[PDB]
Design a protein around this ligand. Structure first.
Ligand SMILES: O=C(CCCCCCC(=O)Nc1ccccc1)NO
Ligand SMILES: [Ca+2]
Ligand SMILES: [Ca+2]
Ligand SMILES: [Zn+2]
Ligand SMILES: [Zn+2]
Ligand SMILES: [Zn+2]
Lengths: 368, 536, 126
């Protein structure tokens, strides 16, 4: 039925500048919000301003030294932290820009507030598109991410929920979140990703966990050019089996949009409808769900995808015609909500997918 | 006994090599030294004999720091784990502490240049160009709003208190960086003096900063309007070409893939694979065809015949008698072979040229069917989308371009045929033809990019199919044998006429004893025609 | 090659007043052919990877579990013995190599290996 979905947005998130020519652009969130305003989706949704997360809420997973470095480093004093900058992997790939700590605070606070809201049972759906940074490690920055807010949100969720299930449909492997919970059975991480000469270079079929957390981490490696039909054919049965064996109490869904066709860094061939089919499938199971952002580097497609999933979570149907908005010219020349795929070859043959699915099923049957 | 000798004989025969066989011997010898248990022995021998159930059953009867995964390494035990201040009980009991996973790669970055057509790079560049200007503009506008709000607050209080009002480094906003960033961008090196003036004496300094910011905002807005005008008709020129990932590869790949030698190799390789399988003695019946293709519509057949006739009728080097002969071959004999004039089959014995012609004709028919199906799908999707979007309350459930009418959507396919005819005549340029096809069929248009050449190829085959006595003798032999009914007939009567069919094949062997002989079976089923070709 | 970036960055600038198993060159299945060990098919259906220890060609999908990407280095086919040696991962590669070379000088040994096979084969031990 129709339920309540808390929405977290801070007006200042769109202004933070990663640098010239850097693929990561917070501006996308702003455009997404703008689209939500011009479809009239603010009336059926509750919008909150996320509180900034103190360093004390970040040091629950990150070391105090790394957080102190993040809070201290500025573009005008890069000379006095060079060694530290080498140590914490802050530099070329993850640059130091103006107000990066405030960006991390807002992104983390949105997801932490959503997790607290879900714990208090004031809602069964919280959305934070500023979140979804899953590559950050305990004491280092990786993959354009500085603070791992997914781990902090799950740590907040664990205070009331015995089992938390995390699902990752970003094209990259969520190594930070999987590594944070590699040896525990209270969190199982499902990741669908491209594998083979690709960042971060982890997430093999045989990475199934360690110690007490064995068989509680599943990875589906893929090839170039997966499309909507294959993704739908292999996502629904695997998630159904995971939910029937694991029986979780809360779900955290990472909705990274770099797995769509035409992405500046991705290789897949999904569309907005096929991407949001996963949201529909997850929502079918009626669990406290926390939807997060993530990757996505073709800015217009990110806006389209995230506004469509926000509409889907509200059980609202929106027209295929884009309404007039502040960033309308981004969406030319068609000005449609849905996107068309390319005709790139799908290298994932049916036998490959069947074999990987069978291996995953046999791995899942071993849970107690 | 001799059973063990026979077993070893068949295994070294089936392994087809000495090195793999010797690896098997190394396995069994390592077992013989009592280092291998029986179950472990069979689990090691399973790779060698996993595809021969008989051999596997016979062998079973005869018998009667640490690292995990692939990318996780154990942390040192004597390693000073970085202390954390917020660790609660769940933090200690849940968080991983012993494995660290090292990225198993070094390549810095390649994005996806492998699959990013130059037309997707222009779109990316235009996007980043838009984003830079937009982010600067919106930072300026947010700072303008913040200063307007603080000025409105200031104007409402007592004049003896205004000189006592001050601002911090957030400058009235919720961020300590953004407003200073905007002021720095506006004022260059003089930014710190203006910032100190704003913090110390807001009353006199706010309006002048607001005026400067507003003037810069207006100038940047008009510049952005001009840049928006320029950025358009680059998206228009790049969008449809960015989604078509195969045209550049497809043109050359298809211009090669249709040569006679390539078609011959495509079946010679399959014949060699089947011959090797027969040599190894694997369980495969010796009656399956090497290649199988499907024709799913007769209308596509007469459309293709009409296209080929249209091209051939405008040929200067083909004489009127040859035009008539090709007409009889194309509109009479070929439909008879496909039985246009269940479980009813036709048998045909052909040389190289007829095999080439059949391959090319099947390719053309399949492509025409693909285009037709795409047009039908487009029309259906448009009608369904119209019906769906008509019934939409949108948010109540708590310029642009004019899409074509339905009539154009259903007339796309005849328009496509007219376009193919125009291209064949040479009245339309290949570039305009390709652009119209792309705008008509989006990402499935490339299927028709090299049609004319294909038709040309087919034409040549037809012409040669008249000039070579072997081909006319082949068709005459088929007709003479069909007059007896041995070549092709009902499926059940096969065993009734099988010996007679053998005679036909015999004659084929004595008519093309220096040339490849092809057995072609046309099987009709549920409105489709399956053409199965096997090389003798 | 006219890009708008220079004009935008100037307009926004601060006032700083301071071998054999592969397709031929034209693209053709080489003849005679070598086939996959699992399906007995050539490179036409899919590219073949060649084991560098034994002359066994394989398909990326015909393996179990299938390979996701091309192996960049030296790859080991699943039809060798060093896999059971890999069960114990503590020992280094030099000892493994010396153990293998302990049987690399009398490679035929056909009489003695059939003899050991029948010697073990007796149901009642001697
Ligand atoms: O989307 C991501 C992060 C992808 C990180 C890819 C790192 C390599 C890279 O492309 N770096 C880069 C490129 C241009 C400019 C600066 C850094 N995770 O989900
Ligand atoms: Ca993923
Ligand atoms: Ca786990
Ligand atoms: Zn990603
Ligand atoms: Zn194979
Ligand atoms: Zn090998």
């Amino acid at each position: 039925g129709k339920k309540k979905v808390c929405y977290y947005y801070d007006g200042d998130i769109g202004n933070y500048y990663y640098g010239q020519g850097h693929p990561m652009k917070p501006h996308r969130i702003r455009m997404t919000h703008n689209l939500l305003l011009n479809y009239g989706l603010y009336r059926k949704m509750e919008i909150y301003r996320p509180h900034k997360a103190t360093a004390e809420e970040m040091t629950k997973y990150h070391s105090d030294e790394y957080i102190k470095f993040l809070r201290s480093i500025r573009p005008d004093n890069m000379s006095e932290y060079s060694k530290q900058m080498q140590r914490f992997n802050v530099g070329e790939d993850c640059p130091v820009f103006d107000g990066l700590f405030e960006f991390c605070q807002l992104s983390t606070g949105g997801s932490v507030a959503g997790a607290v809201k879900l714990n208090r049972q004031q809602t069964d759906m919280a959305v934070n598109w500023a979140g979804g940074l899953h590559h950050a490690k305990k004491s280092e920055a990786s993959g354009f991410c500085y603070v791992n807010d997914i781990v902090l949100a799950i740590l907040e969720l664990l205070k009331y929920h015995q089992r938390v299930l995390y699902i990752d449909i970003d094209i990259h492997h969520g190594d930070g979140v999987e590594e944070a919970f590699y040896t525990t059975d209270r969190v199982m991480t499902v990741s669908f990703h491209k594998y083979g000469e690709y960042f971060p270079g982890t997430g093999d079929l045989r990475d199934i966990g360690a110690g007490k957390g064995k068989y509680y981490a599943v990875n589906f490696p893929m090839r170039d050019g997966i499309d909507d039909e294959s993704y739908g054919q292999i996502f629904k049965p695997i998630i159904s089996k995971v939910m029937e064996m694991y029986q979780p109490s809360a779900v955290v869904l990472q909705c990274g949009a770099d797995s769509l066709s035409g992405d500046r860094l991705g290789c897949f061939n999904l569309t907005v409808k096929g991407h949001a089919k996963c949201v529909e499938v997850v929502k079918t199971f009626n669990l406290p769900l926390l939807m997060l952002g993530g990757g996505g580097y073709t800015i217009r497609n990110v806006a389209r995808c995230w506004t469509y999933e926000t509409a889907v979570a509200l059980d609202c149907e929106i027209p295929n015609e884009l309404p007039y908005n502040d960033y309308f010219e981004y969406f030319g020349p068609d000005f449609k909500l849905h996107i068309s795929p390319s005709n790139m070859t799908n290298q994932n043959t049916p036998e490959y997918m069947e074999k990987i699915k069978q291996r995953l099923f046999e791995n899942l049957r071993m849970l107690p | 006994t001799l059973q063990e000798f026979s077993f070893f004989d068949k295994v070294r025969r089936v392994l087809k090599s000495q090195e793999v066989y010797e690896n098997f011997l190394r396995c069994i010898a390592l077992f013989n030294q009592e280092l291998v248990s029986g179950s472990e022995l069979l689990q090691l021998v399973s790779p060698f004999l996993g595809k021969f159930p008989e051999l596997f059953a016979q062998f079973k009867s005869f018998l009667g720091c640490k690292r995990i995964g692939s990318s996780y390494r154990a942390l040192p035990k004597t390693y000073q784990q970085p202390k954390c201040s917020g660790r609660t009980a769940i933090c200690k009991e849940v968080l991983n502490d012993t494995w660290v996973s090292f990225p198993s790669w070094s390549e810095d970055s390649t994005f996806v240049s492998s699959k990013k057509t130059p037309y997707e790079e222009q779109l990316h560049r235009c996007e980043d160009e838009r984003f830079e200007l937009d982010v600067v503009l919106e930072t300026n506008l947010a700072t303008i709003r913040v200063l307007e709000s603080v000025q409105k607050k200031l104007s409402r209080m007592a004049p003896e208190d205004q000189e006592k009002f001050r601002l911090d480094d957030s400058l009235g906003g919720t961020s300590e960086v953004i407003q200073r960033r905007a002021i720095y961008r506006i004022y260059g090196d003089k930014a710190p003096e203006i910032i100190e003036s704003l913090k110390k004496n807001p009353v006199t300094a706010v309006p002048v900063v607001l005026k400067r910011l507003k003037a810069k905002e207006e100038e940047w807005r008009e510049a952005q309007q001009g840049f928006n005008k320029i950025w358009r008709e680059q998206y228009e020129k790049a969008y449809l070409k960015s989604l078509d990932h195969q045209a550049v590869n497809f043109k050359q790949n298809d211009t090669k893939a249709l040569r006679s030698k390539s078609l011959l190799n495509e079946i010679e390789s399959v014949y060699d694979e089947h011959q090797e399988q027969h040599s190894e003695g694997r369980s495969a019946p010796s009656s399956e065809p090497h290649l199988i293709f499907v024709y799913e519509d007769r209308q596509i057949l007469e459309d293709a015949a009409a296209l080929i006739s249209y091209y051939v009728k405008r040929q200067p080097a083909i004489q009127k008698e040859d035009q008539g002969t090709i007409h009889q071959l194309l509109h009479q004999f070929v439909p008879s072979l496909f039985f246009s004039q269940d479980d009813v089959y036709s048998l045909f014995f052909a040389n190289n040229n007829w095999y080439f012609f059949l391959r090319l004709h099947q390719t053309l028919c399949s492509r025409l069917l693909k285009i037709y199906r795409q047009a039908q799908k487009q029309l259906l999707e448009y009608r369904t989308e119209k019906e769906r979007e008509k019934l939409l309350c949108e948010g109540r459930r708590e310029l642009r371009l004019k899409q074509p009418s339905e009539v154009e959507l259903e007339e796309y396919y005849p328009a496509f045929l007219d376009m193919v005819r125009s291209l064949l005549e040479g009245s339309i340029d290949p570039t305009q033809y390709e652009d119209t096809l792309r705008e008509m069929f989006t990402i499935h248009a490339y299927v028709g990019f090299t049609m004319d050449k294909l038709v040309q190829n087919i034409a040549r085959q037809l012409h040669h199919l008249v000039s070579d006595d072997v081909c006319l003798k082949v068709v005459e032999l088929y007709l003479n044998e069909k007059k007896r009914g041995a070549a092709g007939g009902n499926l059940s009567s096969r065993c009734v006429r099988a010996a007679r069919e053998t005679s036909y094949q015999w004659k084929a062997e004595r008519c093309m004893a220096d040339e490849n002989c092809f057995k072609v079976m046309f099987l009709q089923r549920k409105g489709q025609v399956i053409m199965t070709i096997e090389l003798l | 090659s006219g890009g708008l970036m220079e004009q935008i960055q100037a307009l926004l600038a601060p006032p700083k007043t301071d071998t054999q198993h592969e397709l031929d060159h034209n693209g053709l299945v080489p003849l005679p052919v070598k086939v996959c060990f699992t399906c007995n098919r050539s490179c036409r259906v899919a590219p073949l990877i060649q084991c560098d220890y034994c002359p066994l060609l394989f398909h990326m999908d015909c393996l179990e579990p299938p390979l996701t990407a091309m192996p960049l280095g030296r790859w080991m086919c699943p039809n060798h013995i060093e896999h059971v040696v890999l069960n114990q991962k503590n020992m280094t590669l030099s000892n493994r190599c010396q153990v293998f070379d302990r049987f690399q000088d009398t490679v035929s040994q056909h009489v003695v290996k059939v003899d050991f096979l029948n010697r073990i084969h007796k149901k009642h031990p001697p």
